[PDB]
Amino acid sequence: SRYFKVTACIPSLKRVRTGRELQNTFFTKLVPYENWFTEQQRIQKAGGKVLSVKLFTGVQGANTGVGA
Amino acid sequence: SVLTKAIVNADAEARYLSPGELDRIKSFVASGERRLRIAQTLTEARERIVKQAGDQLFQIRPDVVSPGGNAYGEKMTALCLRDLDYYLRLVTYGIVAGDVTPIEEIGIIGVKEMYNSLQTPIPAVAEGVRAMKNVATSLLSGDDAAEAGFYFDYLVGAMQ
Amino acid sequence: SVLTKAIVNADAEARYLSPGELDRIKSFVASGERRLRIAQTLTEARERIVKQAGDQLFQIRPDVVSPGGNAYGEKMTALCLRDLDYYLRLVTYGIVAGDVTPIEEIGIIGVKEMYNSLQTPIPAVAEGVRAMKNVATSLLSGDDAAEAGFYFDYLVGAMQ
Amino acid sequence: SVLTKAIVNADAEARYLSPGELDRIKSFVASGERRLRIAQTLTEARERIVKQAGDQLFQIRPDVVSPGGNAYGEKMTALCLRDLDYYLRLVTYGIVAGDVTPIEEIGIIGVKEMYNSLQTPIPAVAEGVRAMKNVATSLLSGDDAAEAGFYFDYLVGAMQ
Amino acid sequence: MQDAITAVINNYDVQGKYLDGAALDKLKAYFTTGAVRVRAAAVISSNATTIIKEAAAKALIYSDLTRPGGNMYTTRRYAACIRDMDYFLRYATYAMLAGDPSILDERVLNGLKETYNSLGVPIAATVGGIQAMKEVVGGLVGPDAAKEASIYFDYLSSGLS
Amino acid sequence: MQDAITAVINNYDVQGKYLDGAALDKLKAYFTTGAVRVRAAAVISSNATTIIKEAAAKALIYSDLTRPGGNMYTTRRYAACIRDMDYFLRYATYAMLAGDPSILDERVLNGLKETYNSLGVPIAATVGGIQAMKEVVGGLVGPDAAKEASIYFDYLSSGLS
Amino acid sequence: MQDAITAVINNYDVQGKYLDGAALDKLKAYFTTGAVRVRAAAVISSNATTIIKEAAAKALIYSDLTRPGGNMYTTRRYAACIRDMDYFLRYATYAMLAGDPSILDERVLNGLKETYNSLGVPIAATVGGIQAMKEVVGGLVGPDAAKEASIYFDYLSSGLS
Amino acid sequence: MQDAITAVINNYDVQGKYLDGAALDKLKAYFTTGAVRVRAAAVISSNATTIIKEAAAKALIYSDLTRPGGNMYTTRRYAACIRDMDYFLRYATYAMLAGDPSILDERVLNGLKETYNSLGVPIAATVGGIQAMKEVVGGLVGPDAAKEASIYFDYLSSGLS
Amino acid sequence: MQDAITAVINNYDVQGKYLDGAALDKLKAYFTTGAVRVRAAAVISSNATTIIKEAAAKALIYSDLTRPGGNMYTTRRYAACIRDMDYFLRYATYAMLAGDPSILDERVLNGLKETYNSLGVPIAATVGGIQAMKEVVGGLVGPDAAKEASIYFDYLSSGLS
Amino acid sequence: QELGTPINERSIPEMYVNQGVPALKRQRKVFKQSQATDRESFDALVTAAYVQVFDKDIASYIRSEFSALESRLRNRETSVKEFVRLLGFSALYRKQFHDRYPNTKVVEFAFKHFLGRAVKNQAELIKYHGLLGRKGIKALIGALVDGEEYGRLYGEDTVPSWQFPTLPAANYPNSVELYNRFTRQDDSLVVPSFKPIRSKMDIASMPLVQAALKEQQATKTALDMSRPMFLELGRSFKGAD
Numbered sequence A: 001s002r003y004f005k006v007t008a009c010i011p012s013l014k015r016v017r018t019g020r021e022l023q024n025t026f027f028t029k030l031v032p033y034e035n036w037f038t039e040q041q042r043i044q045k046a047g048g049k050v051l052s053v054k055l056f057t058g059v060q061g062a063n064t065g066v067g068a
Numbered sequence B, C, D: 001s002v003l004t005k006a007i008v009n010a011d012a013e014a015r016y017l018s019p020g021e022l023d024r025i026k027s028f029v030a031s032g033e034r035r036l037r038i039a040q041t042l043t044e045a046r047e048r049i050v051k052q053a054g055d056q057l058f059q060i061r062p063d064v065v066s067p068g069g070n071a072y073g074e075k076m077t078a079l080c081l082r083d084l085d086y087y088l089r090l091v092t093y094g095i096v097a098g099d100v101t102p103i104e105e106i107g108i109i110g111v112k113e114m115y116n117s118l119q120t121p122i123p124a125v126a127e128g129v130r131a132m133k134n135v136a137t138s139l140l141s142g143d144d145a146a147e148a149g150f151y152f153d154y155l156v157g158a159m160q
Numbered sequence E, F, G, H, I: 001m002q003d004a005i006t007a008v009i010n011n012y013d014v015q016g017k018y019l020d021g022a023a024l025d026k027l028k029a030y031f032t033t034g035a036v037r038v039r040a041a042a043v044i045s046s047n048a049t050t051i052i053k054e055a056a057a058k059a060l061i062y063s064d065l066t067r068p069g070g071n072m073y074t075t076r077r078y079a080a081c082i083r084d085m086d087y088f089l090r091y092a093t094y095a096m097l098a099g100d101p102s103i104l105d106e107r108v109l110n111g112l113k114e115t116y117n118s119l120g121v122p123i124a125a126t127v128g129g130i131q132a133m134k135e136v137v138g139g140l141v142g143p144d145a146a147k148e149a150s151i152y153f154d155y156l157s158s159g160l161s
Numbered sequence J: 001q002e003l004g005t006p007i008n009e010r011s012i013p014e015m016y017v018n019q020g021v022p023a024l025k026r027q028r029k030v031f032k033q034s035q036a037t038d039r040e041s042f043d044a045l046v047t048a049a050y051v052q053v054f055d056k057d058i059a060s061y062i063r064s065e066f067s068a069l070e071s072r073l074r075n076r077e078t079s080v081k082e083f084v085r086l087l088g089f090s091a092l093y094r095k096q097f098h099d100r101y102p103n104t105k106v107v108e109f110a111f112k113h114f115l116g117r118a119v120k121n122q123a124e125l126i127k128y129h130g131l132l133g134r135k136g137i138k139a140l141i142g143a144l145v146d147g148e149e150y151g152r153l154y155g156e157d158t159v160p161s162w163q164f165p166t167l168p169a170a171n172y173p174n175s176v177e178l179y180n181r182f183t184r185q186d187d188s189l190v191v192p193s194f195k196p197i198r199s200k201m202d203i204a205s206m207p208l209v210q211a212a213l214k215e216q217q218a219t220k221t222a223l224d225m226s227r228p229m230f231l232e233l234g235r236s237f238k239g240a241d
């Protein structure tokens, strides 16, 4: 139910690529709480920097309604 | 709660509430008074329920209080009783809410890691919760006893 | 039905049924006899309800029986009445089932495409369904009248 | 084994083996004679090691041989000793192969569900493996003792 | 998201407190108004399109918004505005059923303001349309749930403004 | 998936017929036994792990299956067999609650036989485990829902064999 | 997959037996032939492209296969055929290092035949190319590992045909 | 898929022939009717829904198919039948534009017969609806492209039948 | 089996139609080519053994197929292979006389492929022999029926491959 | 001239045109968000995303149910990966491709829709079917979308689309059989499980190992070694005979 708003930059370290390729390297997008964990690992394992993270939807205290 | 579950499903589907969900909401609001009476009864009888559950658990599993047991020691037993009180409180929360959402968000997700990191016997905790169910069912009428027993059975099933 | 919906959600989450789902199943099985009585009442009064809803529909929207309308002519009107009978039978099915699964699978999914192909006014058919709701609640006691009106409202909202 | 692991890693990238991988293979084939000699040395004394490890484990954790223990009774203790023998055989297999590949497929993956369904104490099994490791290293020279202790520690870490 | 029951439950969870007389009173105050929420929500679901049409007729159309140079001009922009209105209606129904503005805050209001500033959407016109929808909903539902539904429309308008 | 009520509803929908006295009799017969199914399902969910353990101890383990050369040998294969047993128990519970074997045919038995032939899994041992679980469930639930639960375990066994 | 060491270990694990004289004899016989396999694999890896070129020249090209309408006509299919020959050579090297054709069965031969009838590839021409590569590899590796290298190419050819 | 030009090009490439007088005459014959195909395709695209409407009215509806027990009974089945009708119309337009039934064989008729056999769809009713669409399209397009449009509808009907 | 006449007759029987102008045109076109087919069949029947001899010499023998271990090593297999070539030639003659490959589908290609994988026969070598016979037959029959003769050999080769 | 002619004249053309991989491998379009800017290109990307998922048949029924997702995607609040993930979380996908098939076939349907291939091997079936049954659809979809293969193949902004794999073995025919199936055309699971392939050639029968075993016998039985000759002359080569 909580959504992370994350901005990241993933450079290309092989084959350079040719067509316009702009949303594939620097992006900002909402990510769910449950999948943000395994995606942050993927971003930093693909040699990508995580510029910004925002809590956005959720509440810091939580304790109920988070798991919905 | 039932309201939270129905709203979440309808919002995920992107539609207004269905007649079945409306009927279940009406049934929940009708049964709310009986639910709060049951919760008040259990809250009043929280101490006796905890004590009788503790004695039943210890008679069933004396090894847990044995030297090679996780619950060996006076404060080790006190902490187990405190966790028992916690789960009884969660049972009252679920009974008042009409579903198991707060219980899930508080005390079943990550509880396998809970007791694996603490080396605590999950089957022993389940037996203690069952003793709690017996004690609480001894203090309610048949319909309310079954209603609380559903939530106690849910806790036992989650502890599995 | 409610059983199908609860079982489907439990299977999708890979878990046994929740206490709230069990409670709603118990409530549905408790309300079954009243649901059957309502269904018997409407199925006995099927012809009068259909004819009356035809009268209020044609009074409210004479243009549909105008030559620039979909239902111009005696057999076009007969087909509209037969669609009305179809929707009334679906309403009885939903009332006995306790939820909207069979009605959804039978007469709402693709109904927009079908009526766009036939060039029939969906708001006009919704008005006919509303006249049906009025006629049906005219032959029913208040609790069961509201119960049937919920399903009629669901059909009206779906045709939208 | 080492060859299987290197071949799988090369096949994942779809290329011929690099000279570094051939160097690892050469080192493994050089150490193979010592590895098989260590394995036969452990195999000759399999019963004594199992018996002493069982006695040591029962001394450290008497609760398992207590009334509430999983291994309470002569036949329950026999099953525990048979499991310890199984793990000794797996350790000899791993020492011969030079990699933990056979051990993982035979007696590690799913071991958690194994001992959870059987309600057996996983830390108790780990302590039994540690006592087995001590008995094994008492019968081996220093380098061979360390070589066997690597695989014993791997088993202890996996059963965790 | 949370309803009234879940908000009370988590406010007691943070203190680790059993439910007491005050929490029971709050839950009873929620429960006594349960059926009114249900009937009003059913009425709103039945008359969703008519409410949107009347609110648009009173607040948006027949103005410079629907003419060239307006933010309502062109079929695409009109579709966006009416889809937004339908979103507001459905989420107002959800909030009024749950007895809490948590769902409206979580799933609508986050980002909507600066999104509208970036796109050029008129916040004042959106608030006026929301208020017209609120008045239509209050007219349809009746005295029993008029104010009860209007509080969440006012929440939406105050969040936007 | 289908239950008794939905099955009768579709069986009349295919003829385009209103519900009559016969269909009313059938769904009345289902409605009369609603609570017993709920109680038995709650008991099964309560004793899920113990039922699996007792069925395994009575039908599978302490044999050549759990020894070297046995199909259920090794921790991975044992975990797979117990997960299959858990699948059978949960889907038997669902079918018993729904009052129909449609979910059993429709989420379990489709292709399971051929998958078991491809993997080499023993169908006879699987059927024996299913019958042991059926006997344990019949013992636990009591006379009220024993036959009703047991018919779906027999359905699973007859579909597999 | 599995090599000689894992084959012995699995064959003893299925019986649940500790390693005995026969198992140690098999392991010693494998360990003695360690350096020869490594040298042969290094030679094949260094001369991979020349082997493919000579095998293609001797068995495939200058014929109806490369003339129009042939299966190896067009660059799109010529590159695919030489890539397939490279795959066969690489997996033969893996099999020679492991001392077991289990990798050939698991990761080369399964589905390959029916794939070739699906695509229209000539199985006999593929077998001829494999045998040409076998002759070239046997020439390159020397008398030490000629038979060991040739056995896996014969295994691949017999599996395909 | 292939059009007329790529079909000729591939047919000569497989024989390794330069384009000769016959191939040039074939290409000239296709090019001479390019404009009529484009005009007919534009007309069919503009009148797509109406053609399906008259085809359904003259072939399917007002019969036992739309009644209970019919294949196109219920809104879901009616929508599926009209979507299939639209599929046939769009792919017939593609075939008439490309001047070749290769796309129809590749992406329409492949497995359609046995899929309809599995689902119980009436193949005779489908052929009748296709012929109704053929008559409507022939009426709309005119003498210029009537027969050329009709040949591909006949191709689809003969493939299904 | 069926010839051109019976194919037209059955294709009109399935519609229950009397013979029309198109059917009569097809029958006339078949009847005009009567003497050519008879002459070609007589030439092939007279030169049957020589065609097989030249095709075998050009495509099969003097190679690993006839050298030991080959699939046509030993007299027992050589006689079988030449008998198979004679069978292909005879059925091609039948199909050429009938003007229809239905006999080839019914009595030659039915299960021939899977029989060849069962026995281990090289299908590519069989196709090469068939095309060698095709070249020899095209040389023998003359320019009158060369294309007609060649099409059925191509049909057989494409069916096998 | 004659060295570029076919030999064995292609008497029936376009019997050789269709050989090789199907034309569908290269006769289809790939959609990328980075080059799908503007409204006209965005709608094509959206309608293509509904066809990679949902397999083109019940994709035509979608009218406006996924309208909040499309708005966020158009406003660049969520990437195409997030759009594809949320499409797999919907009730429509669960109703269509999970609620009517066994748990093992849902994994196959999930793979072909969110990765473009079939299941690689038995060690991947065990990993992914053993997670779907443990935690349901919302974990299996998250595992596929967040996997390393998805990140390599499509990255942030790209519709998944069918891939015709070359490796591993049997992956190409398994994938193509899934590809050329209409929805509800066939419901056999194609890859139920990967059979054990067993062993038909004993490792001790190889040339190198068998050649070393005989030497091992002779060296141990016949000849002596580096202990004193008085010890080596009082040895019995047989042990119990």
Ligand SMILES: *C[C@@H](*)[C@H]1/C(=C/c2[nH]c(/C=C3N=C(/C=C4\NC(=O)C(CC)=C4C)C(C)=C\3CCC(=O)O)c(CCC(=O)O)c2C)NC(=O)[C@@H]1C
Residues within 6 Å of the ligand: D057, D064, D065, D069, D070, D071, D076, D077, D079, D080, D081, D083, D084, D086, D087, D106, D107, D118, D120, D121, D122, D124, D125, D128, F061, F062, F063, F066, F073, F074, F075
């Ligand atoms: C030190 C002993 C510990 C212990 C063990 C214990 N185990 C069992 C029963 C079984 N253990 C196994 C084990 C395996 N099967 C395999 O394939 C492998 C991999 C090689 C293993 C490790 C199995 C299958 C069983 C079931 C019986 C059977 O083998 O047929 C028991 C008995 C439990 C019961 O309920 O009877 C015990 C007690 N107990 C301890 O206290 C120690 C920690």
Ligand SMILES: *C[C@@H](*)[C@H]1/C(=C/c2[nH]c(/C=C3N=C(/C=C4\NC(=O)C(CC)=C4C)C(C)=C\3CCC(=O)O)c(CCC(=O)O)c2C)NC(=O)[C@@H]1C
Residues within 6 Å of the ligand: H060, H065, H070, H071, H072, H077, H078, H080, H081, H082, H084, H085, H087, H107, H108, H109, H112, H115, H119, H121, H122, H125, H126, H129, J057, J058, J182, J183, J184, J185
């Ligand atoms: C005039 C309508 C007739 C009819 C049809 C009918 N079809 C279905 C279901 C499907 N139809 C298709 C068709 C295609 N998929 C393709 O890719 C193509 C070519 C590009 C075609 C033609 C498929 C795959 C299905 C199954 C999936 C789906 O439903 O979309 C149905 C529904 C059957 C059911 O309820 O299960 C119907 C009714 N029915 C009639 O009566 C007409 C003759």
Ligand SMILES: *C[C@@H](*)[C@H]1/C(=C/c2[nH]c(/C=C3N=C(/C=C4\NC(=O)C(CC)=C4C)C(C)=C\3CCC(=O)O)c(CCC(=O)O)c2C)NC(=O)[C@@H]1C
Residues within 6 Å of the ligand: G060, G065, G070, G071, G072, G076, G077, G078, G080, G081, G082, G084, G085, G087, G088, G107, G108, G115, G119, G121, G122, G125, G126, G129, J019, J020, J021, J022, J164, J165, J166, J167, J168, J169, J170, J171, J172
């Ligand atoms: C000597 C070459 C012969 C030949 C071959 C040919 N093959 C293809 C296409 C494919 N080959 C494979 C092979 C494999 N899949 C596997 O998993 C492995 C092991 C890693 C193998 C060896 C596959 C799957 C394909 C299809 C997919 C692809 O193209 O990658 C082709 C091309 C066919 C086409 O493009 O349609 C050719 C030509 N052809 C000959 O004439 C030779 C005898």
Ligand SMILES: *[C@H](C)[C@H]1/C(=C/c2[nH]c(/C=C3N=C(/C=C4\NC(=O)C(CC)=C4C)C(C)=C\3CCC(=O)O)c(CCC(=O)O)c2C)NC(=O)[C@@H]1C
Residues within 6 Å of the ligand: E065, E070, E071, E072, E073, E077, E078, E080, E081, E082, E084, E085, E087, E088, E107, E108, E112, E115, E119, E121, E122, E123, E125, E126, E129, J068, J069, J070, J071, J072, J074, J075
């Ligand atoms: C309508 C009364 C007013 C109006 C609105 C308008 N909105 C947009 C664009 C967007 N609106 C949304 C809204 C939502 N997305 C969500 O998920 C939710 C809650 C579930 C909401 C409310 C978003 C995200 C957008 C941007 C993406 C999109 O366009 O879909 C427009 C379009 C602007 C443009 O052309 O770029 C418009 C016009 N316009 C009026 O005149 C009214 C005052």
Ligand SMILES: *[C@H](C)[C@H]1/C(=C/c2[nH]c(/C=C3N=C(/C=C4\NC(=O)C(CC)=C4C)C(C)=C\3CCC(=O)O)c(CCC(=O)O)c2C)NC(=O)[C@@H]1C
Residues within 6 Å of the ligand: F065, F071, F072, F073, F076, F077, F078, F080, F081, F082, F084, F085, F087, F088, F107, F108, F109, F112, F115, F119, F121, F122, F123, F125, F126, F129, J102, J103, J104, J105, J125, J126, J129, J130, J193
């Ligand atoms: C246990 C009583 C028996 C047994 C079983 C066994 N099963 C497997 C592997 C699988 N089992 C399944 C099962 C299902 N998939 C479904 O969708 C359903 C119904 C919803 C079922 C029941 C599947 C798909 C597999 C394959 C994938 C996996 O392993 O998870 C094994 C493992 C076999 C192996 O090692 O390859 C075993 C052992 N074994 C016994 O001895 C009993 C008779």
Ligand SMILES: *[C@H](C)[C@H]1/C(=C/c2[nH]c(/C=C3N=C(/C=C4\NC(=O)C(CC)=C4C)C(C)=C\3CCC(=O)O)c(CCC(=O)O)c2C)NC(=O)[C@@H]1C
Residues within 6 Å of the ligand: G061, G062, G063, G066, G067, G072, G073, G074, G075, G078
């Ligand atoms: C000529 C300007 C240059 C050159 C050429 C050269 N080519 C070959 C051999 C072959 N060339 C091909 C080509 C193709 N096959 C195709 O499908 C296509 C696409 C239409 C092409 C272009 C092939 C298949 C062969 C192999 C033989 C065969 O066709 O059967 C050679 C001979 C190489 C050798 O004998 O080893 C040569 C020399 N060489 C130059 O130096 C020029 C610059």
Ligand SMILES: *[C@H](C)[C@H]1/C(=C/c2[nH]c(/C=C3N=C(/C=C4\NC(=O)C(CC)=C4C)C(C)=C\3CCC(=O)O)c(CCC(=O)O)c2C)NC(=O)[C@@H]1C
Residues within 6 Å of the ligand: C064, C065, C069, C070, C071, C072, C076, C077, C079, C080, C081, C083, C084, C086, C087, C106, C107, C118, C120, C121, C124, C125, C128, H061, H062, H063, H066, H067, H072, H073, H074, H075
């Ligand atoms: C009546 C209140 C309105 C109206 C209706 C109208 N309907 C038709 C024709 C058809 N209607 C259906 C309907 C259904 N088939 C189903 O399976 C279901 C679900 C239970 C429904 C609702 C069908 C199939 C037809 C086609 C004919 C047939 O049944 O065979 C018409 C005739 C249109 C024509 O062009 O002939 C009309 C007029 N018209 C109104 O004005 C009312 C608002």
Ligand SMILES: *[C@H](C)[C@H]1/C(=C/c2[nH]c(/C=C3N=C(/C=C4\NC(=O)C(CC)=C4C)C(C)=C\3CCC(=O)O)c(CCC(=O)O)c2C)NC(=O)[C@@H]1C
Residues within 6 Å of the ligand: I061, I062, I063, I066, I067, I072, I073, I074, I075, I078
């Ligand atoms: C020699 C005394 C007489 C003779 C022989 C002759 N043979 C051939 C050609 C072939 N002979 C064989 C024979 C066999 N294949 C088998 O499997 C066996 C059984 C072991 C035999 C005996 C074959 C297969 C051939 C074909 C070529 C090949 O082997 O690949 C010829 C050549 C004929 C030609 O037309 O080329 C001849 C001349 N001829 C005499 O006059 C002698 C009396």
